[PDB]
Each structure stands twice: as structure tokens, then as C-alpha cells.
Amino acid sequence: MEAVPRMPMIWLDLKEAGDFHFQPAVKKFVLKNYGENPEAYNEELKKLELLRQNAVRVPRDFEGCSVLRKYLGQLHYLQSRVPMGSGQEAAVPVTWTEIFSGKSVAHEDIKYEQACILYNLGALHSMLGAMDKRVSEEGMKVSCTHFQCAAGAFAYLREHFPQAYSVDMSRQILTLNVNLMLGQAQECLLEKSMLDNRKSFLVARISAQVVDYYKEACRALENPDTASLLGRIQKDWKKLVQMKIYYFAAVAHLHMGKQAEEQQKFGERVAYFQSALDKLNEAIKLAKGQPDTVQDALRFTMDVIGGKYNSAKKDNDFIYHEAVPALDTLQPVKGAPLVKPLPVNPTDPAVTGPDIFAKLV
Amino acid sequence: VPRMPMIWLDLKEAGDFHFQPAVKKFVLKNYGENPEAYNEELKKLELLRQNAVRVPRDFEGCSVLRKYLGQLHYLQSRVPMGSGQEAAVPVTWTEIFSGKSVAHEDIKYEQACILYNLGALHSMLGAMDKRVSEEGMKVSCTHFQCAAGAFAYLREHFPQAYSVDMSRQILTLNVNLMLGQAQECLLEKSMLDNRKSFLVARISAQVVDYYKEACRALENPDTASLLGRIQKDWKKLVQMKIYYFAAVAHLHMGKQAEEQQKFGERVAYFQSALDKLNEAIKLAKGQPDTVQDALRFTMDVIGGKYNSAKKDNDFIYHEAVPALDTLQPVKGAPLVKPLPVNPTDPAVTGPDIFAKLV
Amino acid sequence: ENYFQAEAYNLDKVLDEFEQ
Description:
The complex is a heterotrimer, with two copies of chain A and one copy of chain C (20 residues).
Chain A: H1 22-34, H2 42-56, H3 62-81, E1 94-97, E2 104-107, H4 110-131, H5 137-160, H6 171-195, H7 200-221, H8 224-230, H9 232-262, H10 266-286, H11 292-320, H12 349-352
Antiparallel strand pairs in A: 1-2
Helix pairs in contact in A: 2-3, 3-4, 4-5, 5-6, 6-7, 7-9, 8-9, 9-10, 9-11, 10-11
Chain C: H1 3-19
């Protein structure tokens, strides 16, 4: 399974920004509250303006993630000194396009700007994770980290912005994104554990956790409220995720059979390979109409499993003569979560750089 | 610029938290045989706790508590050690005001007390600096905001008071007290930065607002009986600061009037400032000379400015001295907030200890 | 800072811990 073709990965689109005309409000605030000349802070106002321009049309590359983090941090610094939140003195309209309906959604709340930047940070990470071919050890670790970062941005959004500014950032939808990104992160790590030929029981647990994440993501995709919101996107994701559920369940039992082989449980060995083959055949059924990237991985795995089943059944029938136990007689494989949503500290000075607005207050 | 003394909170004393037996029991049934693989992940947390519960009272002391607080979150994510859960063990800490030992079989009790001590340590580091230089005022201000943030997080995420020192009313007292002192540090900075007199007046008025909030809690009978002597010493300093910074506020309102050539209004504000200061001196009885020296010098400033203002008005300007209700009160300008704690920040927690406890 | 690169590099350590 070292050379198994890599499955395609899902990525989210970035939200697109409207207007955020903070400049008049900051100068209104400094004039009225500080009794100072607002033009003394024009330079701090250029930096944030230039920083926003870069962030709202961020380039889709690794460096773009730092641009979004730095702008996210500077928004926190600005909010600490100028009250631009909901119902506050210096608040101005913040407009962003809700990604699923295309509606313009406006809030006089700087936290709305923060939320959408954080959403795009998670989206951008998902893109960078999905772009890599994951041929080399480096690509698998970089993609895995990208997906954990994407899960971390969506998780932070879910926890610290509980009031959903738009339906694309509701708790249910962000939970879908997190579970999907963790499933894809765990998947990359599974590919790593195989290329390193880790202990077979280890791979089986890692693969079983891939199933668990995708099952939770699939439960949200089957929720009618999510289906009507995502529309055709829900159909595209569900097809791939449901197929992956059975594919990686087959991979798990494939390696459970490898473990049985190592412990000389030769009857148990054929049972797991038989189960792995049945689960894969269901994945193949669910994969009909999907691109060749998917088919090549399934075909490749069918050769592996099919060959191992014939070997195990021939060994048991002519040498070991051990009873083939039913599946329920065997303790199930418990998934091992080795990935997590990586926490975000928006005001970490090491990522935000100097506070643009240190001269205020 | 006068520099008043600052209040700080003592750290809670930790008792026993014998998590090793429960973890080993949990991993044996749920993950099978070998306990030996997990003993070092348990010994690393144990040493982390020993450092945290004997944290040195310095800046990195905060990182030690932060690091341990984060690893506790990682442990709770893998081993169910909350109240009513499989692997819960007794957690014992000393309630700081009564000295009584309080035990809960809940890992969130350990987290709460570590978080409390993080806020207490910040208050100490903020109150230790003499605030002579711009960096000292801002550093202390950050510490007091971090202390407010720790007590606020405790108030929001642990609503069920594990002990009376962490009840909603007492944490609210701590937050307002810490924000008042943070605001006070920025007031001092705004004075040495020569900010506009109207802004200094608003900043000082907000100091009064925070301390009034703290003072109403200190006057609550149930808090007085719980805090004991501490309520006396806090209230004595807070009540004095209420009138002192109300005088500082009206001092600078009178200086704004001077800038706008409302020389009658100028007398009214200086007269009001002097009266408020005299009450602060009434309330400052028995307080250390740091307090007395600050008040004595402020009396020189306000007392002289009142005499000059009244002489000028009586012989030159002859403008009507308005009472006091005719002038819109000063609106406070909050410049400080409880800073987020970020308990699971990888930059401070380091790698997750229990990567084997999956 | 190198948080992203540090996390990606640590994945080897993660699997190593989980293997022992």
C-alpha cells in the first residue's frame, strides 16, 4: 500500500469581501474623544488599509496564510483601542458575501470582519492541503498540517464567534468543516504511516479513525438543513465521503489481517481479509461515476486485498486448518485520533508583528 | 506624577491530585495491558504540577502555570476525569480566605485553581513594578489586564463556584479591581505623555467607575464576612482612590476650562477637586507614606491652582462660578479589557504530553 | 515563528510516540 494512488481531497472556497470603511470612524473617534488632530494617525491608517487590500484578495499560496493572520491580529489591536463592535461608537458597516446564497450580509461590527478573515484562513489552508499530490513524506506532512490548520480556524470561529453572522458560519456548518478537515488530515497521516511501514495494528487504528471523522461529517451532510444550504456542494462532498468511509474501513481490516498474520491467528487472518474485501467492494459500488483518481486507488487496493485473501485462505485450508471466526466475535478496531484543530492565538506578536496602533490610547 | 500602591491577590495553596492511579486503571481496561508505556507521560505531568504549585513569583511563573493548565486540557480530552466520570480522582485545594481544604473529584477543579493562580500571579507582577518609566506603566497595565482576563475566564467558563473565593461576586470584584488598576496605570502614562486635559479627565473618571463597582461589592455584607481583614484593607484603599481620582478628574476638567477661558467654570472644577481630595485625605488615615506623599503633593497642586483661579476670577475675569449640577458629568473612557487567556496556546503549552494516551 | 513547520516536523515524533 506504499504505492496506493492518493485520494482526492475536498477544499472550501474563500468568502469575498465588501467594504469596510474604518478610516472616517477612527478619525471621528480620535477627534472627538482624544481632542487630537486625526491626521497624526494617517500612517497607521495606511498600513491597515494596505493590509486589508492584501488580505481580501489574498494570493492562494502559503504566504497568504501569514497575510490573513497578521490582518486578523491588527483588527484585534484596532478593536482594543477604538470601539467598533456591535452597537459601539465608532462602528461602521462591514459587508461580506455569504458564500452559499450569494447574498450581501452587512454588520456594523468589526468582529464580523474578523470572523470572515478567519473563515478564509481556514478555507485557504484547505486549498493548500488539497493542492499537494502527497507523493513524498514532505507532502503528506505539509498537507496534514494544512488540514489541521483549516480545522483550527473553523474551530476557533465556532467557539469564539458563537453568534453566527451568516449561515455559512453557523455552528452546524463549521462542525461539518472541522470534521471533514480532520478526516482529511488523519488520511494524510495514514498515508505517512504506511510509507514508513508502521506497525500494522497502528495503521489499522489510524485508518479506523479516518472512518470515524468521515462518518461524523457524513451525518452532517445528510442533515436536511445542511443539504438545502450547501445544495450541489453537499452532493459532491457526500459522494466522496461516503465512498471513503467504506474504503478506509477496508484498509483498517486489511491491516487487522496483517496483525493476525503476525500473531499467527491464521483463521482470524482470513476473516479480516474477507471483511476488507467486502467493504472495498461496497466502496467500489459507491465510487461509480467518480474520476480515475478514485478508481485507481480502489483498483490498486483490490489487487492488494484480493492477493492477501487468497494467500491467507490457501494457508489456512492446507496448513493451519483454523476456524474462521465471525466478525462479531472479534473486538472492533477503535480509532486513534492523532490530529486536532490546531489552536489559534490571533494576538500572538510573533505572527501579527508590531501593533500598528500602539500610539493610540 | 503620583504613583499609588496597588492591590494584589495571593495564590491558592494546592493539595493532593493523585491522577496516576486512575489513568493507569483507565488505560488497562480501555486500551489493554501494558501500563509501563504511559508512566513517563504521567511523570512529566507530575513534575509539571510540582513546578506549577510551587511556581516562582516572576514573569516566567506565568508560563509554568500556563503550560500546566494546557496539559490538563489535553489530559481531560483523553481520560474522562470530570465530575461523575470514570477516572475522576479527588482534587484538593485550600480556600484562600477561610483556609479550609476543599475537595472535588473533578479535573476542572484543578484547572480552575491553576487559572486563579495565573490571575493572582499577574496581579502580583503588576503590583511589584514601581512604574517609574513608560515601559513599567504599560507592563503593569498588561499584567492587570491579564489578571482581569484570568478571573473573567474563570467567571464565564466555571459558573458553578467550586469554592467561595471563586464565586461570581468575588471574581467580579477581582475583575473590576484589576481593570481599575490597569486603567490607573494608563492614566499615569497619559499624564506623562501630556495627553489633552479632557482625555486625562475621562480616563481618571473611568478609574473611579471601576473602583466604585469594586467598592459596592466590598460593602456587601456576605463578602465582608468572607474576606475578613482583606475586605477592610481593600476597601480602605479603594474608597480613598475613589475620591482621589475623582479629584484628579475634576483637576483636569478645570485645566480644560482654563484652556477654553471659562474662568468661572475653572474655579468650580478646582473647588470641587479640592473638596474631593480632602475627603480622600480623610479616608487615607493610617495609610503608608506612599499614599500620604501622593496626596500631600496633589494638595499642593490643586490647592495652589484653586487659589490662583479664584484670585484671577475675583480681580480680572469676574465670571459666574457655576454650582456643579449645571455641568454635564465627566464620562469615563475605558481603555482596558480582560485579556484572553488562550489556555491551549501551543506556543506556551508545548507538544501534547499524552500523544500515546490515544 | 515556525509554528507550521514545527507541527509538520513533529508528526514523525507523534507516530513514534504512538508506536512505542
